[model samples]
Target chain A: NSPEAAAISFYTWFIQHDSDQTYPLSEPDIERYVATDTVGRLRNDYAHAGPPNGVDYFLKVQDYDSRDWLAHIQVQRALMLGDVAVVPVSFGSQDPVHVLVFLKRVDATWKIIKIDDTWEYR
Target chain B: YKGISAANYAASNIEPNSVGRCAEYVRKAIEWGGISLQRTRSAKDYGPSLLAAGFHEAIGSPMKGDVIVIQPAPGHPHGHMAIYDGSHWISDFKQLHGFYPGPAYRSAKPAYKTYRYH
Candidate 1:
């Protein structure tokens, strides 16, 4: 399948499973996954950032007034041993942000395991 | 602009403010296409076109004379872009700017494994 399709599937699943929280936007239920250790750290990190990485930024600028903010995730490469998929993504618009995600495929599903790096402005 | 340019320099080991540096990188993959690079502080500024261009460059698929645009990722908002010179690597000159806890060479890594240009 195209990388775009895979990305869409993953994100769709993420939104569906995520819960609403005032401080941390998308808090997942720990019982659903095999490992629940990193949940706290993840919430804390995102909370400190003051918003979900990409979505919050979008809402802040009111760019939604002029265009449709779209997110496209592309798998740049994958390492079987690491169980990691490196995805290079761009938001859809005239000015797009470049982001690379390192995800761990666990339990027959893909989890946003980690981040290798991301490209943005100063 | 300085930060973005600086990040590019650090990652690619390339000089900053050089003429057409961004264009040169993009042209290498896109075969002489019109390109514009922007410095945005938010994710709302990002989109598919930018992503496609970045992907093409990251993967080293540029043609001669295409524009290479570099900026920060929406997620980080503090990083920058460097061109891929047809290898599984991106180059920058700013790698030496920050503090070092270990060897200077350990600061940066090859930006990506695959790249695309739009």
Candidate 2:
């Protein structure tokens, strides 16, 4: 599959896994998927709190960010197809703002494989 | 639970005779399984280290028989210790503290503001 297609599939898998409340998903799992399909584990810490809320929190942020969150992801380029398509992204709730560069397929299907930059508060 | 075993061993095999003896016994039990242990002078150093270790393992791979130690936060120097259940959970040697088995993540509050050892 194309890198963007793979990324979308991986995101879907992440959201599905979150809804399933798959507790204690190990680092190996993260490494496996991250190595071939994507990067980072699907925040399982939020999953233990139970469903709906876990799914809701993940999806809500996903929707609010309009895929920008995934776009600026640090490991985006490593997981994408080409180096041509990059998306500029910035995100934060308050105080320090986090910024990043996102890459995507020429088709506009956003796939993140590199995080160009970031800044955080103390 | 392993806590019961450790506590029993502490009460029977090890004596809580000295000022920090109970903490020592718990630390020894956890370290016996090949996990690393850190010694701290005060409770403030112990608890944070234990929690930090737990946090580190949470993000990484942890085995079934790992040890996590925490000293009592400042003002409470008795200290505490637990065995890692290997499933991202912690079982306190002292049953009174209850079981805390969950994914390791950032806490809203300073869960380990005091002394930590492991």
Candidate 3:
């Protein structure tokens, strides 16, 4: 599995799926994107998360209103124990807010699992 | 921001912020994140405040600005708080390596609450 490619797609999902298009990602896109058990957890955030909101919850801004998601992969490797990899990237929107993409090799296939973009905690 | 930043300074041997514990970063980060609080300064105390402020426990995956609170332990009555800034998931933070429960406390141990600002 391509950890690096998986990492890049993880961050680019929102941009490539760009919210202004009204509906960026299809249902399969989500299934193909997340790790096991993520769906149940994501739905817990809101009764009904619309297009960008679903993706927004993972980024600096809630929607592409700023359309500032110009993230470039800065770090691309898994941490010790190696089951999961952490990819760091710089942001174009929340310029000061950097993002982390965590990918776990689920069943021999790399999958983008989670993301963190809060500032102070970084 | 200064408090936790200094505490996790990524530097060697400097006195940590005087707030008393690493969890104090929640309050400091909250204020710096554009919210302020005077009443709740303890680790577990902020969960209610966070929830009241529209923050809720993470039932699934966490986002950019998620905050997590570890339940109080017998050794420490109050609990711990960890905020994630995307680069560092609350689960993977490494402070001085193995110091004070270092980052896995967010999810690995299974005795805490996770919250994210919608």
Candidate 4:
């Protein structure tokens, strides 16, 4: 069995998150996948509409600016160092964007603890 | 919805990067939230009109349903306004950064203040 099922589910749900409505998963469901602190913050977003727009706003702008840009998300690196697993995903071309999903083993499976993304140019 | 709630709700609903329309945001919210409005004014001057219309400057702590009017700062001053939701304040800005949720870095910043409502 793939050891990253929980981690994969987090990525899948995130990539498919829609801005038109509230997120699909409730608080407790992500307990195994996210930290309790992060989970609490998510609740604030849902309840207060904090950020108020979330990353959907940024993704939408990228989609428009690069209107015809040909880019695909690539899983560049996945490795576990000590207790943390860092999975780096990249979006292609002149201005490359990278997202590093960090995970840690939680009982039988791995769960994301932090994820960081930055737009890098080469 | 009462104009106050509508004002806050409408303010909270604005998408990021949607620039200006600051005054219009409050006016439309007031209108949609069911307040009669004759016209729109600049957010900076909008306060006085609100005061004249019976909205007074808030003293001490604020309560829910309060409309906040901030003078903002010089140079970049057009002023800013938002509706307070008791513990949390809701409003949209032009945004210099992304408004990601809890997991991401850089949560909501600055803050809204100087509460008033009609």
DockQ, in order, for the candidates?
0.04, 0.02, 0.02, 0.04
List ranges where model 3 is wrong by over 4 Å. Answer: A20-26, A48-55, A63-68, A71-75, A93-96, B1-118
Q: Which stretches of candidate 1 lie over 4 Å from their true place?
A: A1-6, A12-24, A27-38, A47-67, A71-81, A120-122, B1-118
Candidate 3 docking class: incorrect
Q: Which docking band does candidate 2 fall into?
A: incorrect
In model 4, which residue pairs have backbone atoms overlapping below 3 Å?
Answer: none
What is the TM-score (0 to 1) of chain A in model 2? Answer: 0.32
Give the alpha carbon lDDT tens digit for every residue of B1-118 in model 4.
Answer: 3745754665576644333334444555565666644432334456655665556677667666566655433222344555555654444432232221122222223333454554
Which scores better on lDDT, 1 or 3? 3
* Cα lDDT listed for each candidate: 0.34, 0.34, 0.48, 0.48
Report the TM-score of chain B alone for all candidates: 0.29, 0.37, 0.62, 0.61
Candidate 2 per-residue C-alpha lDDT over B4-118 given as tens digits, one digit per residue, 9 for 90 to 100: 3433333333321122223344455544433334554233245544654443333234444344444233322233344444342232223232222122212212143221223
* C-alpha lDDT of residue A24 in model 4: 35
lDDT of 4 by residue, A12-112 (tens): 55445433233333526567577677666655654454322222211211121121123344564467788888877544444555567777776767766
Deviation in Å, model 2, residue A117 alpha carbon: 50
User: Considering TM-score, which of the candidate structures 1 and 2 is the better prediction for this target?
Assistant: 1
- Rank the models by lDDT, top first: 3, 4, 2, 1
- After best superposition, candidate 2 residue B103: deviation in angstroms? 23
Over A2-113, each residue of candidate 1 has an lDDT whose tens digit, in order, gives 3334445544443343222211223353323212444555555434433232232212321121222334323444444455565665544555545555555456566555
For model 2, residues A58-99, the per-residue Cα lDDT tens digits are 222211222333443322333323564443333323321233
Candidate closest to the true structure, highest lDDT: 3
